[PDB]
C-alpha cells in the first residue's frame, strides 16, 4: 500500500456506509412512530384523516429512501485491493455521517410537525392545506442534505 | 439424479391411486389431507436425497 | 509494535469488548432499578368502598 | 323491551333466579347434586332422540 | 384468525395436513416425536372419559387438539425417521455412505470419503463430526427455503382457486398472475438454483459451486457475471427473470383499478403484498432455527445424562445413574415436550397465519351459529 | 401410580442403552472419547434398567 | 417518548378502551327522550355501563340512585386502573385519589369545630378521595387532635404543613377558605409534580390542564369575593394557588381587584377565557372548556396525561348525567341539552 | 502467545461463556420477577388463575436454562492454547446469547406482568397471552441459534 | 448527576492526555493507535456478528414486549385486538429475521487464514466490513422494532375502537416494516461487498 | 504527505462539511418542528394567522440553506495535495457554522413557538415576532459569513 | 513472568474470588432487604402467617451461601506460580457467579415481597409465592453450576 | 514545521475564530429566543410596549456583532506556517470572548425577559431595566476588549 493510500481506508468508507444506513434508519423509525401515533389518535375520533395522515409516514419512507440510496452509492467503492485512498475513506465517513445525521433531523422535525398536524386536523382538518406545507419544509431539510451528501461522494470517488 | 425423479414418479402414482379411492364419507377431506401429506413427506425426503448425492464438505471426527 | 505509552492492542481489544460489556450490564441495572409493586392490588385498603 | 316474550322471560329469569337459590342452598348444606349424573344423560338424550 | 369468506363446500382444510408436517419439520426429534405422538394416543383414545372428565384449564384446548397433537406427533415421528437422532443419535438403520482412511490416526483428525448418498436422512456417519454443525446448517437452509417456498406457491394456487371459484376478472388479471411472476421470477429462481447446485457434482464437474447468497446478491444489484453460474443461459435467465419481476410493479400499482380514489388501497395492498412476500421467504429459515434449536437442546440434555449416569460404571455409580435417568427423563419431558412442542406448534400455526392464509385468506365474513340448547346444566356462578 | 410409566420408560431406554453397549454402536463405547469397555457400560446400563424395572414393579398399582 | 409502554403500556390500552365505553351522543339523546325513570334506566343499560340500573329496584330507582350507580363505577374503575398499575402511574393516581381526598378531609373536619356526631360523614365519604386516616380523624374531636390525625397517618401532611397554624378555624370558613387553602396546595403540590416527574408531551398537557384547574379555582374566588366581608384582598392573593396559566399578569391583578369590574375585566387579559366573565356561567362553561382539554389529551394517545383526560372528561359525563337525570325525570326539559356530549 | 494465537484469546473465550450465563442469568432473572409480580397480583385477587400465571415464570426458567446451556456447552471447548480465532469465536457467541437472553428475558416479563393483569380482569385472554410469549421467546431460540453456530465453528481449526 | 460527573469527567482527562502527548513530540504515537491497522479481523468479524444478532435480538424484543403489553390491555376490551395484534408480534419478528439472517450470512461468510499480506489486507477489509455490517444491520433492526412497537400499540388503541382503525393504521406498520427490510438489504448488500477474509 | 501536509489531511476538510450540514441541519429541524407545531396549534384556533406564520418556517429554511451552502462549498474545495491547512481550516469553518446555524434554529423555533400564539391572538404582534425573528436571521447570516471567510482563507494560504 | 503466566496470574484469580462473594453477597443482601422489608410489614396483620413467611430470607441466605462456596472453591485454585489463563477463569467464574448472584437476589426480593403481600391479602397463595421463589432459585443454581464448571475448568492442566 | 511554528498552528487559529464566533453567535441567539419569546407573550397584550420591547433583541444582535467581530479579527490574523503563538493565542482569544459573549447573551435574555414582563405591567420600568441590558452590554464590551487584547498578542513579534 502507498502512503496515500493506507489500509484503513475501506475501513472509514464502511464507516460512513454504516452511519448513512443507522442513522437514517433510526430517524425514519421516529418519524414513523410519531406518524402512527398521531394517525391512532386521529382515527379514533372520526377516521376521515385515516388516509390524509399517510402524508407523514410518505415523508418518513422518502427519508428512509434518502438514506438507502446513501448507504448504496457509498457502497459502490468497496474492494478488497480497491488501492482505496484515506480521502476518499475519510470522505465516505463524513458523508455518511452527513446523510445519517440529516435524515435523522429531517425525521424528527417531520414527525414532530406530523403529530402535530394529526391533533390539529381532529378539530379542522382543512388546516391540512398548511400543514402538508409544513411537512415539505420539513422534507426539504432532508432532501438537500442528501443533495449535499451525494455531492461529496462524488468528490471522495473522484 | 434419476433416483429422485424414480421416487417422485412413484410416489405420484401412489398419491393418484390413493385420492382415486376415496372412503366412504368425508371424500374430500381424505383425498385432500392423504395427497398433501404424502407430498410433504416426498419434498422432505427428495430434499434430503438431493442435499446427500454431491456433498460439498465431508465430516471430520476424532473419537474414532 | 507497542502503541502510545507501554500500551499494547492485546490489551486494547480486551478493554474495548470490557467496555461494551459494562455498557450491557448499565443498561441490565437500569432497567433492573425500575421494578415496582402494583400495592393498589398487591394490598389490601382501608376504603368501605371500591377497596 | 319490544320483544314479544318479555313477560316469559322475565318469568323464565325468576326461576333461574329461584334455581340459583336453591343451587346455593344445595351449596350451603354440601348436596351431592345427584341429578348431575342424570343431567347427562338429558344432554345425551337431547343430542340423538 | 377469522371468519372465511361464502362460498361452497367448507375451507381451510389445507392447514389441517401442513400445521402438524411444519411443527414436525422444526420439532426434529424421532424420540420426542414419538413420545409425544404416544401422549396424544393415550389423549385420544379415551374420548368418551375425556368427554366424561371436567374440560379442565388448559387441558380443555390440549383435549380439543387430541387429534391436532397425533398428528403432529406421527409427522415429527417421520422427521425423526429422517433426521437421524433419536436423541441426538443416528441409530444408523441403513448402511453408512462415508468411510473414513483404512487406518485412523491413534489421536488425530481425518476427512472421511463417501460412495454414494444415504438411503433417507442425514448420512448416518454424522454423528460428533466438527463438519456436521456446518453441513447440517447448509443442508436445512435448502430445506426450509425449498418447504417455505412450496407451502407459499400452493397457498396461492388456493387464492387462484379462490378468486377462480368467483368471476373477478379484473381481480384475477391484476392481483394473481403479477404476485405469481414476483415470487416464481425471484424466489423460485432461487430455489431452483438451489435444487441446482445440488444437481451438479461440482467436485467432478470441477467447476466452483456458485454462492447462492452470491447469486442472489448478483441478480439484485448487478446484470449477473457472477464468479460462477449454474448455466450460461442461466445467468441470461435470471437477468430475464429479474426484469420481468421488476416490470411486473407497474402491474400491481395500475392494472387492478382499470376504472379512482379506491386505488389508494390497491397500491397499498400491493406494496404490502410484495414486501410480505419477501418478508415471509426470508423468514421460513425460522423453521431451521426452532429444529436446530431443538437438536442442540436434544445433544446438550442427552451430555448431562451421560455425564451424570455412566461416571465409572460401578455399583455406586449405577446408583447415581438410577436416578439420572429419572432426571433426564423428567427435564426431557417437562422442559423439551411440554414446551419446545407447544412453542413449536405455536411457531408453525404462527407462520401459518402469516405467510398461508396471508396468501389466501379474503376477510372476514358472517360466522354460522347452530342455536341448539348448550345442556350445561352446571357452573350456577 | 405416576411414577411407574417413568420407571417404565427408564428401563426401556437403559435397555437399549445396554443392547447398543453390549453390540458396540459407533456412539458410546464407539467414541474415544468416551470410555471404551463396552461391556462395562452394557453391565451398568443393564443393572440401571433392572433398578428401573424395579421401580416400575414399586409402583405398580392394582385399584 | 416510547419507554411509556414498559411501564403502563397496559394501563394505557385498558384506560383507553374504558375510554371507549363512553356515553354515545346518539344514545344520550335517546335516553334524554326517554325522560321516564325507567326508560331512562333501560337507555343507559342499553349504554355500555352495563346492567347497573337492573341493581336496584325501579321503586328506589331515582336520578339520586343513576349518580350513586355512575359514583360506584367511577370508583370501582378506578381503584382497578391504579391496582394494576405501579411507580409513576401509582403515584398519579395517588395524586388523583388526593384531589378528591382533600374535600374528604374538609368534610371530616366539620364534626370537629361544631360536634355533628361524625358517622353520617364516614357513611358518606366521597370514595374516591378515601383517606387511609379518616377512621382517625372522625374519633379525634379536638382541633388539635384532628390535625394530628391529618399531619401525622395522613398523606396530606404537607399541605397542612404549608397552611392552617393549628386549625383553629375560628373566623375562617372550611368549604370557603380551608378547603380551598388546602386545594391551592394541592394544586401546587401537582403542578410542581408534573413540571418535575412526568415527561413529555404529558409534561405539557398537564401543566396546561392544571393551569386551566387553578385559573377555574381563582375565578371561583373571585366570584365568591363580593359577597364575603372577609377574605381580604391580601388574603385573596394568598388564597390563590399561585400557580396556573392566569399567573401572574391576570391572576395577581384579579386578586388585588375587589369591585365586580376587576373580576370580568381581569379575565380579559387572557384569551383563552374571555367571554366566560361576561356571558354564559362560570361552572357551565368551566366544564366545557375542561371536557375538551380532556378531549385534547386523550388525542395524544401515548401519555400519562391519559388517564387524567379519562378521569375529567368521565367526570364531566357524570355531571352531565346528573343533568339529564334531573330534567328528565322531575320534568325540566328547556335545559335537558346543557349537557356536553362532544366526547 | 503467537500472531495468530495470542494468551489473551482464551481469555476472550473464558469471559465469553461467562457473559453468556451472567447475561442471560440477569435478564431470566428481571422476567422472572416482573412476571411474578402479576402472579402474585392475580393469584390474591383471583387464586384459580395462579397455575396459570406460572407458565411464564417457568419460560423464563427456560430462558435461564438456555442460558445456562450455552455457557456449558462454550465452557466445555475451552482450553490453554485455543486459537485467536477461537477466542473471538466464543467471545462473540457468548455476548450475543446473553444478549439475545437478557432481551427476551424482560420482554417476556413485561409480557407476562400484562398477561397476568389480564387474566385477573379476564380468563380469556390466556389465549393471547400464550401467543404473545411465544412471540417473545423466539428471539432467545434465535439468540440459541446464532450462539451454537458460533461456538460450533469456532472450533474448526487452530494454528 | 453522577452519569453527567463521569461523562464531564472522562472528556477532561481524554482532553488532557490528548493535549500533553500532542504538546510533546510524541503527538504521532496517538495517530498510530488512531491507525489501529494492527487489531485482529477475526476479532472485527466475531464482534460484528454478535452486536447484529444482539442488536436484532434487543429490538425485537423492545417491540414484542410492547406490543404484548397493549394486545393484553386491549383483550380485557375486544378479544379480537387480541387476535389482530399477532399481526404487529409477527412484524416484530420479521426484523428479527432481518437481524438472523444477515447474522447467518456472516457466520458463513468467514474463513481463516494465515498468509501475511493476504491477512493484512484482504482479511482486515472483510472484518471491518462484518463489524460495521452487522453494526448497520443492528441497529436497523432495533429502529424499526422500536417503530414497529409504537405503531402496535398505537394500532391495538385504535382497533379498541374501530377495525376500520386497525386496517387503516396497519400502513404505519407496513412502512416500519419496509424500513427494517431496507436495512436488512443494505446489510446483505455490505456483507456481498465483502470478502471471504485473506 | 508531506510532514506539513499528511495523508490524514482531508479528513479534517471533510469532518468540517459534515459538521457544517449537520448543526445547521438539526438547529433548522428543531425550529421547523417548533413553529410547524405552534402553526398547528394555533391555526386551528384561527386560521386566517396560519398564512402569516408560515413566514418563520421559511425563516429556518434559509437557516439550513446558509449551512447547505456552506457545506456544498467545503466539498467543492476539498482536495488531498494541500488538505492539511486548508483541511483544518475548513474544519473550524464547518464546526462555526453549524454551531452558529443550529443556535439561530434554536433562536427561531423559541420565539416563532410564542410569535405564532401573539399574531393569532393579535395580527399586529406579528411585524412585532417578525421583527424578533429577523435578529436570528441576522446570527444566521453571520454564521454563513464566518464560515465563508475562514473558507476563503483556507485554500489560498497552504503550500 | 512466563509466556502464558506473567507475574500478575494471581490477580485475577484473586479478583474472582472477591467479585463472586462481594456480588453474590450484594445481590442477596437486596433479597433480605425486599424481603424484610415484606415481613415486616405482613406481621401487623397476620403473624401467624409471617411468622412462616420467612422463606424468602431463607433463599436469599443460600444465594450468599451459594457464593461463598463459590470464592471458597476459586481459592483453592489460586497461587503465584499458577498460570495466567486459569487466573483469568478465574475471573470470569467470579464474575458469572456474582452476575447470577445480583439476578436471583433481585428476582427473589421481588417474587418475596409480593408472595408475602399477598398471602397477608389471601393465603391461597402462599404455594405460588414459593414456587415463584424456587423458580427464581433455579437460576442461581444455574449460575452456581457454570461456575463450578469454569473453576474445574481453570483447575485443570496449565502451563 | 518547526517547534516555534509547528503544521497545526493555523488549525489552532481556524479552531479559535471558530470558537470565537460560535459560542458568541449561540449566547446571542438563546438571550434573543427567549426575549422575543417575552415580547410576543406581553406585547400581544400591550401593543404599546411593542416598539419599545426590541432593546434586548437589540442587545442580542450587538452581542453577535461582538462575536462576529472577534471571529473576524482572529481569522484575518490566521495565516498559513504562521507561529504556533498566532494559534494559541487565537484559540485563547475565542475561548475567551465566546464565552464571554455566551454569558452577556444569558444575562441579557434574562434581565429584558424580566424587564419585558414588568413593563408590560408598568411600562414606566422600561428605562430602568435598560441599566442592567447596558450592565449585560458592558460585559459584551469587557469581553471584546479582552478579545482584542489577545489579538494584539497574536500579532506581535513572533516566529
Redesign the interface.
Known sequence: ?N??A???A???G??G???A??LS??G???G??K???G???????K?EL??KS?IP?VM??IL??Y??VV??LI?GN????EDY???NG??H???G??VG??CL??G??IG??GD??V??Y???P??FV??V??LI??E??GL??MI??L??NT??SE | FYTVVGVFIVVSAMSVLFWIMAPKNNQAVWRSTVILTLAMMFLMWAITFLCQLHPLVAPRRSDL | DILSSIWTEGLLMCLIVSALLLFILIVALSWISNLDITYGALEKSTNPIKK | FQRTFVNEIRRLDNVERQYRYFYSLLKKHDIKLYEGDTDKYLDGSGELY | YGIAQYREINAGLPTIVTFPFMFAIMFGDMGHGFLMTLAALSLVLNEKKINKMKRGEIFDMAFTGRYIILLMGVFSMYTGFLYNDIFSKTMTIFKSGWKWPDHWKKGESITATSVGTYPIGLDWAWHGTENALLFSNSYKMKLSILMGFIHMTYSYFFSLANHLYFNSMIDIIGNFIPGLLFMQGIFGYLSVCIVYKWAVDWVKDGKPAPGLLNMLINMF?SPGTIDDELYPHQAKVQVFLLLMALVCIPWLLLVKPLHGDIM?HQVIHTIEFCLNCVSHTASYLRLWALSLAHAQLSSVLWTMTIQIAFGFRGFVGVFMTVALFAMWFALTCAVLVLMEGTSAMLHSLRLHWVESMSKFFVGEGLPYEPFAFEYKDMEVA | WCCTVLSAFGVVILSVIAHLFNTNHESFVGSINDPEDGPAVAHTVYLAALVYLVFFVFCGFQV | G?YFNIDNGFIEGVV?GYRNGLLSNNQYINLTQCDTLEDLKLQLSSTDYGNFLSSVSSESLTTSLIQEYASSKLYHEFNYIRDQSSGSTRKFMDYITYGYMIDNVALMITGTIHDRDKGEILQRCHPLGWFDTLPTLSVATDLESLYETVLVDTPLAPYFKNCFDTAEELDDMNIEIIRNKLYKAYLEDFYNFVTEEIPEPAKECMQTLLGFEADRRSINIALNSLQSSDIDPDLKSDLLPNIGKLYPLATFHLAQAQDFEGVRAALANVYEYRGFLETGNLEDHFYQLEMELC??AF????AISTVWAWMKSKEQEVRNITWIAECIAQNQRERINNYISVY | MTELCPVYAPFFGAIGCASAIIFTSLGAAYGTAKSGVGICATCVLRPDLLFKNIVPVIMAGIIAIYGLVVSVLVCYSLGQKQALYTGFIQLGAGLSVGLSGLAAGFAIGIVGDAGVRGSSQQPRLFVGMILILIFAEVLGLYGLIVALLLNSRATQDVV | SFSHFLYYLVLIVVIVYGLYKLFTGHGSDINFGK???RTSPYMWANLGIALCVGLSVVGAAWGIFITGSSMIGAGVRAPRITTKNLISIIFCEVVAIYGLIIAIVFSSKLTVATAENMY???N???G??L???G??VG??NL??G??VG??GA??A??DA??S??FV??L???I??S??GL??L???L??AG???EFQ
Open positions: 500500500s502512503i496515500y493506507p489500509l484503513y475501506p475501513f472509514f464502511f464507516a456506509c454504516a452511519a444506513m443507522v434508519c433510526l425514519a423509525a421516529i414513523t412512530a406518524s402512527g401515533i394517525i391512532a389518535g386521529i382515527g379514533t375520533f377516521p385515516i388516509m399517510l409516514v418518513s419512507g428512509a429512501i438514506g438507502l448507504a448504496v457502497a468497496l474492494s478488497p485491493t485512498t484515506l480521502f475519510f470522505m465517513l463524513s458523508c455521517l452527513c445525521f440529516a433531523s429531517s424528527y422535525a414532530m410537525v402535530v398536524g391533533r390539529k381532529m378539530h379542522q382543512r388546516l398548511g400543514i406545507l409544513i419544509f420539513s426539504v431539510l438537500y442534505g449535499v451528501a455531492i461529496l468528490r471522495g | 444489484l389508494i | 416510547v383507553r378531549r385534547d388525542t395524544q394517545q401515548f | 491507525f489501529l491497522l493484512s489486507k484482504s482486515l477489509y472483510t471491518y466490513s463489524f460495521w455490517a453494526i448497520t441497529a436497523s429502529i424499526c422500536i417503530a409504537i405503531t398505537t394500532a388503541i385504535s375502537a374501530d376500520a382503525l387503516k393504521i400502513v404505519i406498520e412502512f416500519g419496509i424500513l431496507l436495512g438489504i443494505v446489510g448488500l455490505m461487498k465483502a470478502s
